Amino acid sequence: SKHTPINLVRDLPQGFSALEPLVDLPIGINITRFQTLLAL
Amino acid sequence: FQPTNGVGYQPYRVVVLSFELLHAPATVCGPKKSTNLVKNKCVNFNFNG
Ligand SMILES: *[C@@H]1O[C@H](CO)[C@@H](O)[C@H](O)[C@H]1NC(C)=O
Ligand SMILES: *[C@@H]1O[C@H](CO)[C@@H](O)[C@H](O)[C@H]1NC(C)=O
């Protein structure tokens, strides 16, 4: 993951930024589908 | 039963902690006890494996 302040909205920001590792859980399961969550 | 039951009749607590090795993650270590760190000398080092 990485966090960075940007200015563009409808388009992804211009520039380069590496992402650092944050979590390395050994879940030891296999995943074939995913979904996001939202707050209303 | 009695609080001073003899062997073979008194309650027997058992724990069956089981060692398992499968597709589940294998977080297995060894009997490595920490030792002092020396410097400025030719030594055999083992940092995290
Ligand atoms: C992924 O699916 C495979 C074979 O299709 C199955 O063997 C396995 O149970 C799944 N992997 C995990 C870590 O659950
Ligand atoms: C909260 O902000 C956004 C605006 O669309 C949305 O979740 C909702 O319409 C707003 N009002 C709520 C959650 O009560």
Curated annotation (Swiss-Prot), chain B:
Changing residue 2 to R: In strain: Omicron/BA.1, Omicron/BA.2, Omicron/BA.2.12.1, Omicron/BA.2.75, Omicron/BA.4, Omicron/BA.5, Omicron/BQ.1.1, Omicron/XBB.1.5, Omicron/EG.5.1. Changing residue 5 to Y: Increased binding affinity to human ACE2. Changing residue 5 to Y: In strain: Alpha/B.1.1.7, Beta/B.1.351, Gamma/P.1, Theta/P.3, Mu/B.1.621, 19B/501Y, Omicron/BA.1, Omicron/BA.2, Omicron/BA.2.12.1, Omicron/BA.2.75, Omicron/BA.4, Omicron/BA.5, Omicron/BQ.1.1, Omicron/XBB.1.5, Omicron/EG.5.1; May enhance affinity to human ACE2 receptor. Changing residue 9 to H: In strain: Omicron/BA.1, Omicron/BA.2, Omicron/BA.2.12.1, Omicron/BA.2.75, Omicron/BA.4, Omicron/BA.5, Omicron/BQ.1.1, Omicron/XBB.1.5, Omicron/EG.5.1. Residues 23-45 are annotated as: Disordered. Binds to host ACE2. RBD also interacts with the N-linked glycan on 'Asn-90' of ACE2. Cleavage of S generates a polybasic C-terminal sequence on S1 that binds to host Neuropilin-1 (NRP1) and Neuropilin-2 (NRP2) receptors. Interacts with host integrin alpha-5/beta-1 (ITGA5:ITGB1) and with ACE2 in complex with integrin alpha-5/beta-1 (ITGA5:ITGB1). May interact via cytoplasmic c-terminus with M protein. May interact (via N-terminus) with host bilirubin and biliverdin, thereby preventing antibody binding to the SARS-CoV-2 spike NTD via an allosteric mechanism. Attaches the virion to the cell membrane by interacting with host receptor, initiating the infection. The major receptor is host ACE2. When S2/S2' has been cleaved, binding to the receptor triggers direct fusion at the cell membrane. When S2/S2' has not been cleaved, binding to the receptor results in internalization of the virus by endocytosis using host TFRC and GRM2 and leading to fusion of the virion membrane with the host endosomal membrane. Alternatively, may use NRP1/NRP2 and integrin as entry receptors. This is Spike protein S1. The gene is S.
